[PDB]
Every structure is written in C-alpha cells, then in structure tokens.
Amino acid sequence: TPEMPVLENRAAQGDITAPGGARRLTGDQTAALRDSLSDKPAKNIILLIGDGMGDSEITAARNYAEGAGGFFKGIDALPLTGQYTHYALNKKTGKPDYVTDCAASATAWSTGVKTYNGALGVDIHEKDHPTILEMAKAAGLATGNVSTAELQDATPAALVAHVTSRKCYGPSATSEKCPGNALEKGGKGSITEQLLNARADVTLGGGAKTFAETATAGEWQGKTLREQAQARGYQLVSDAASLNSVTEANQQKPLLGLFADGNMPVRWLGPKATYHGNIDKPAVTCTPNPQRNDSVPTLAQMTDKAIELLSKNEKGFFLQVEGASIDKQDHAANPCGQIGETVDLDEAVQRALEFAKKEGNTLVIVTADHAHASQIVAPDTKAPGLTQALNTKDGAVMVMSYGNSEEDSQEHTGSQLRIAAYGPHAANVVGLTDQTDLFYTMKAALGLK
Amino acid sequence: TPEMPVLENRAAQGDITAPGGARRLTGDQTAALRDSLSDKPAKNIILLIGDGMGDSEITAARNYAEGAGGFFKGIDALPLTGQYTHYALNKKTGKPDYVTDCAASATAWSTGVKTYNGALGVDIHEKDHPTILEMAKAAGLATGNVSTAELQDATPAALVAHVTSRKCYGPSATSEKCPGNALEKGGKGSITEQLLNARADVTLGGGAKTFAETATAGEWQGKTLREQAQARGYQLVSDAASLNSVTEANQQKPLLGLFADGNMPVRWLGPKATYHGNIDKPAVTCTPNPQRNDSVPTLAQMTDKAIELLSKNEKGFFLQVEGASIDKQDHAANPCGQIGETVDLDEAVQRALEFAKKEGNTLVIVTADHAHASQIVAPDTKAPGLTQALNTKDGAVMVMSYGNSEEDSQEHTGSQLRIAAYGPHAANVVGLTDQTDLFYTMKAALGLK
Ligand SMILES: [Mg+2]
Ligand SMILES: [Mg+2]
Ligand SMILES: [Zn+2]
Ligand SMILES: [Zn+2]
Ligand SMILES: [Zn+2]
Ligand SMILES: [Zn+2]
Predict the structure, then answer these.
(1) CB burial readout A132-165, b (16+ within 10 A) else e
(2) Does residue A162 contact residue A190 with C-beta atoms inside 8 Å?
C-alpha cells in the first residue's frame, strides 16, 4: 500500500437516541484493517507519550471537548490498538511493584529492561543500558526529544541520562543524592550534564533553571551549564520566534530550546477538585490560562518544528514527544488543566499522523507511561475524595473524582492502559504487550541494534 | 486459514530483572495478526461479558493470581483488541449520562440503541426493539444465556425482556413499578414472565426465588412461574448433576437451570476493604469460599454444557455468558471476591476459545459493560476510601483502593474499557468502538437481520 488508513471518523454516526445513532464504525473493518498491516521497516518513529494518560483520562477529556459521542482527530484516529503492562521492580527484591513512577516506566520503554522506581537508564543493579535515543543516533539517525515539562523530568531525561536517582537534575543534586554519578567523583554527571553530552539534534522543553548551575569539574567547570551549551555548539532558543527561526539543527548545529524556567505553563485554567465539590460547588467550564504567554510554543508547535528539522536526515529520525502536564494536573486534582493538556497533546498527535500519513514510512505510537487517579463518576456521587462538576460540550454535566490519596497529591495507578500505533510494525502494539516490548518494537521497526 | 491464532503465551519471557526479561511478545506480529483477520461469516457467537470488569479489574486479578508478569490463559489470549465507549442517555434530555448502569449498557449491545439507566430493551421513548438473542432465534439459530447472577438481573434479562424498569423482576414488582408492562394491564409481563415467554434453548443462572411468584393474569394465572415453566415444556435443573444429565435442549425441550435462590455464590472469600486497611490491617490472601456448594455449577461448567447442547444446531447458535459477580464484589469493596470472580470468568473464556479454536467459525468476544470503582495504588498509599493489602502470587504485596463513594456501595465508572475478540469479523472490535457497534458486529458476523 502507498499508505495505510489512519482512522477517519469514529464519532457517533448520528442522533445518539435512535437505532445505530451512536455507532462509531460505519462498515466492517477486516479489509481496512488488512491494509494498515505492514512489516516494511519504519524509516522514522515518533513516540507521543501522554504522561499518566490512561483510558480514564482519554474518555474524560473527549467527553469535555468533543462530547461523549465525539472523536479525537489525533488521539483516536490510530487504527491499531492494545493494552500494555507497566509495573516496576522492587530494588531490594527484584519483584514487581505494581504501581510504577514516571522514571522506571520511561526506562522500561527506552531501554527494554524493568527497573526500580526513580531510576533513569540504569537497572535494579544500577548498571547502565543504551536507550533507543542513543542507538538511533549511533546508527546515524536524527534525534528529537520534545516535552512540556522540564527537560530534566523523567520522560525526557530517561533517553539521555543514567542516574541512580531521578532527582539528580543538575551538578549539586547529583553530588549529594547521586555521589556515584557526580562528574567530580568520576560519574558521567547529572541529568542536565548528560543531556548536553548526549547531543540529540532537536531538544525542546522547559527547565532552563538547572542550566543556571555550573560544573563542579570536567572541561567546563565554573561555566554555567548554559554557557557550556553555547560553548559546545548549541543553538539555544527561548521562544516561539527563536524556534521558528531555526532553519537547521544537526550534530554540528544541535538545537536546544528552553522555553520555561521550570515546567511549561498549562493551557486551560480551572479550579481544583474539592470534597463534595460536585454538590456544594457549581458546574465548571474551563477557560484559557492567562499565564501562558503568546511567546511560549505549544506542544503541537514544538512537535512541528522538530519533524521539520529532523526530517532533513536522509537516514531517518527518532522523536519522542511528551504531553507532560496531563500527569501533573491529575496529580493536582485540577480537571480543567488535566483535560486541556490532553487536548494539547491531541494536536501534536495530529501533526504526528499528518507527517506520518504523507511520508508513509513512519511508525507513530501514542500511549502513556502509567495510569492515574482520575475517575468519571455519576453526577450525584458522594465520594470520600475530591470531585468537581464540569459542563461538557454535550450540554450535559460530567462529574470527575480523585479519591486515592489523602496526602496532598493524587496518585498513579497500576491498571493496564491503551497503546495505539499506526504504520510499519504497528502490528506489535495489538493484543496485550509490555512497556518493554515497546522498546524492542521501536528497535526492529527501525532495524536497529 | 483453517484456523486463526489464539494468543499463545504473552506472559513475561524470563527474569523480569534482565533486559527483555519482561517482554511478552517474542516476535513481530504483523503476520500472525494477518492470520487472525477474516470476514467469512461467524457461524456461532459467544459473547463473554465481565460485569464491570474494566482494565483495572483485569490487571488486579492477573497480578494476584498470575503475578504481574503473568498471562490469562483465556482472558488475555485474544488476538484482537480495542477500547469502546458505553455512556448512557438521560431519559429527559436525550443527552449523554457518562456513567451507565448494568441495564442501559446491556441494552446498548443487545439492541444497538442507547438508552436511559434502568431500561431493558426499550429506548428513552420506552419503545421496544428486537434483541440479538431474539433475532438469532427467529433466524433459526440456537440461543443460550448463561450467568452467575439471578436470571432477572440486567445482563441476562436484557436479551429476553422489555421493561421500563430493570426492577420489574416478577409479577408484583411489575404491576406496581411497571404498570405499563403488567401482564394483567395488558403488558408483555415481568422480566421473569418475558424470559419464559422468550424460550431461549439454554438458560442457566440463579434467581429461582422469583419463579416462586404466581401469574396475575394470562393463561397460567394462579400457577407459580416455576409451574408454568414445567407446564410449557421446560426442563428445570437445580444442580451440577441435573445439568450434566441434560442430553438435549432445544425449542421442544428447552432447558432452564435455576442453581440459586438469588445470585450464585462467590468463588473466593476474603475480607472487605477498610479505611486505612493497607496500614492498620495485615496482608490478605484469599481462600476458597465455604458457602459455595459442590453441587452448584461453576461458570465454566455452565458455559461448557451450553456449548455442548447448543452446538447441536445445524444452523448455529448465539450464547451470552456473564461473569456477573465481578461487579457486585467491586461494589462491595471485597477484593478477594472480585478477583476470584474474574478467575472464574477466565476459565469459561478458556472453554469459549477451546471450542472457538476447533470449530473455526465462532466469533468469541470478551468485554465488560462498564468500568468500576477499583484501583491499584502503591503499598504506602493513604487514601480517603477503602484499601486492602493483598499477597499476590509474585510474593509481593499489591494494594487495592475503592474511594469514589461514601454511600455503602462503591460505584461504576465512565472510562472506556477493553474489548477483545477472536475469529470471523473480529476485526470490528479493534480501534475505538461503541457498545452499540458490538450489537451490529454480532449481526453482520451472523449475517442476521
Ligand atoms: Mg513527565
Ligand atoms: Mg450484569
Ligand atoms: Zn508519569
Ligand atoms: Zn506523577
Ligand atoms: Zn454492570
Ligand atoms: Zn454494578
């Protein structure tokens, strides 16, 4: 096939009150499904990760923006689907820890080995293993690592660094919390240090704050990590304008955009869930966040510029886009922020398939790292956690719930979650797989080693 | 193909602490996946429903019985997967109700039209529509409706009865709660009355208690509903033995097994979740329930005998098996009960595929009606709801949570849930579908109208 079908319109066919008025699929898929099938080697691989975006997150965001009977043009439009396991390993026992953190998970799919919660590219034994990003580069492909969080955060960090603690952001954190990785003690260095040493062609996200540090040793001691980036041939860009002006990025001219002191500003603003908020409080309608500046690139924008620069490589490219704050907002009990963040990720996904569809050799994979606290309860539910009534696009009120923690931060769940793919070797996400399988798939699809 | 591949072993490949030690898929599936594809008409269709068994349910049970790295021989061994929406409609507004109940859902997939919570075979307007069971029978196929709940409960009821309230069990409830259906007022009758009137070839479950009623009018007034069954040519069997002796069931000799006064007994016994149960209480390990009698057929057993009698029809058969109590135990915050019940469903599923695999023309579909309260939180989680620490087959302690209700019953959730199929037209469950599509798939697969 000169192209495989991307899911067209699986949105409710009509009047959801009539027979077949709700149906999503119009015909029998056997054939369409037959066409999506392919083992021709993927030439590019874009992995869009929705941080903590399980099935519950997806439903809730769609319900709100597209309505119950809606369809996500980007997120839902992927023909091949499955569920995958993502548990962690207990550092002392080598036994499962049913609820993984952001790191062990990002490592499982980036190295193909299960690890303890809080590890980045190192196994329970603390030994390092090459990441899919590193292997791609070695094989001469192009690297991209896009995110809305700080680049030091787990998901991005896990493709470019190897530290025993995900807390070893820069120089100091590392000296004390990861003595064994402290560049001055002979370690490879902090997450920030190793990210710059890693040199991926396109690196966009926030977290410029840690570049403020200065090396403790090495060839660039005294020099702020920012200075060293410049000194090493990096193109640093601080806004939409600067990014849009980058006409090329490669190993000679690698681009690094630091669009935020820490985490990038959330798109939608809305109150936080409260105890009995679905009954003592009124219905909520999210609105655009005043804080997010017109100069701070959206996920879809970053996702776009990267595909562009990255697509210049004759050999091909590897790109990880992460809608980071879905997680964070799930953690904060803030439905308007959590949902808006999934909508934002949806756009990036749209651009992924847009490229993927024309190019015809790109494997696009949309999944999350783990499940989160959020639930869609009935309107009159009386829950022990935090709720909130949202006015959805349907005109109907949807109630959300967060009751799995009393500590002031809701939390990750162990349930299996969806994994949707499209393109070459997209077959391998179907059925029940593991978060590590993802890594091996990305390998074979790219014909890597 | 003389047969399509049923998922073999997607259990962790080896030592979950080494590279690829956790992997579930050994190779590239593109081809294997190519082989499962087929539009040759389904000759039989077994629908195995897990009452309230979303992904979270499945993960929890697999962890406890098979270990995190485990694999369900029946539930996970299905090659084609997807996610499907199941929201209900608001009776007054014709708008979505994001959290459907057991009835509206059972109807969405049994009639192909969305309905209000509490309706059975009637739309929001209260008009009746033919069920997939009704259509199969007319077409000359065989009918089988198997369940671990009372036959009067939603899931089974929704294939044989049309009432305005799913509470209209027998003669009396109907007269008052469904005056418009009261046989004496000229209605089609109660759920029990309409079930017997429907005359499906094989009907096994519990709920003998409502047969104790006597008709208020009709040709059999005065006669208990259980006398009328005998009077209409019914084979009533009360235990494992009775059932095992039934050598034939059909329209002339339809079988009706009533194996419990109400709901059938749960398989495993265990305490109920408690406030801070994961910290004040010790680790739980489920044990076999003392109440369950050696004479009461297990789901798999009923599922087996049915496939046997139903498979005698030259034309083919339609069979709906339901692991009813997974739901009820989720509602009860009783982990050991909820998990055990998914284990019990898994076995039936195994028989479903065992048949389906040899026969080669059977479409087997394993899904749930909605998502439920249950969550898998971390060991040291301090939740506002009810938790409980379970000792899983791994050796590790898995903690579960139920915090979406303060009312004394945990409740259904709206998130999309899995839908796994295998065989003819299995393709149609892949991607994102709707609970109503399931009904239309069952139609085309069977070439019905
Ligand atoms: Mg993250
Ligand atoms: Mg049911
Ligand atoms: Zn995460
Ligand atoms: Zn988190
Ligand atoms: Zn249910
Ligand atoms: Zn229920």
Answers:
(1) bbbbbbeeebbbbbbbbbbbbbbbbbbbbbbbbb
(2) no
Q: How far apart are CA B50 and CA B324, in angstroms?
A: 7
Contacts of B89 in chain A (CB under 8 A): 16-17
Burial class (CB in 10 A: 0-12, 13-18, 19+), A186: exposed
Q: Which residues does B229 contact at the CB level (< 8 Å), separation at least 6? A: B196, B211, B236, B256
Asked if A110 and A153 touch (Cβ cutoff 8 Å), the reply is no
Does B395 sit within 8 Å of A406, measured CB to CB?
Answer: no
Distance in Å, alpha carbon of B104 to nearest chain A alpha carbon:
12
Nearest to A16 by CA among B88, B110, B107: B88
Q: Which ligand sits nearest to residue A155's alpha carbon?
A: 1
Q: Closest to B17 (Cβ–Cβ): which among A89, A112, A416? A: A89
CA distance B97 to A378: 8
Nearest-angstrom CA–CA distance, B402 and B411: 9
CA atoms of B136 and B276, how far apart (whole Å): 50
What are the sequence ranges of the domains in chain B?
Answer: 1-449
Q: Evaluate the CA torsion angle A423, A198, A244, A349 in order and state its sign.
A: positive
Which of A18, A114, A377 lies nearest to residue B411, judging by beta carbons?
A: A377
A425/A39 Cα distance (integer angstroms): 5
Q: Are A302 and A146 in contact (CB under 8 A)?
A: yes
Strand partners, B434: B85
What residues have CB less than 8 Å from A127, skipping those under 6 apart?
Answer: none
| Nearest to A171, CA basis, from A194, A151, A154 | A194
The experimental technique used to determine this model is: X-ray
Would you tell me which residues 58-77 of chain A have a C-beta closer than 8 angstroms to some C-beta of chain B? 58-60, 63, 67-69, 71, 76
Region A1-449: CATH code: 3.40.720.10
Ligand with the closest atom to the CA of A52? 3
Closest listed residue to residue A370, CA positions, set A29, A66, A111, A53: A53
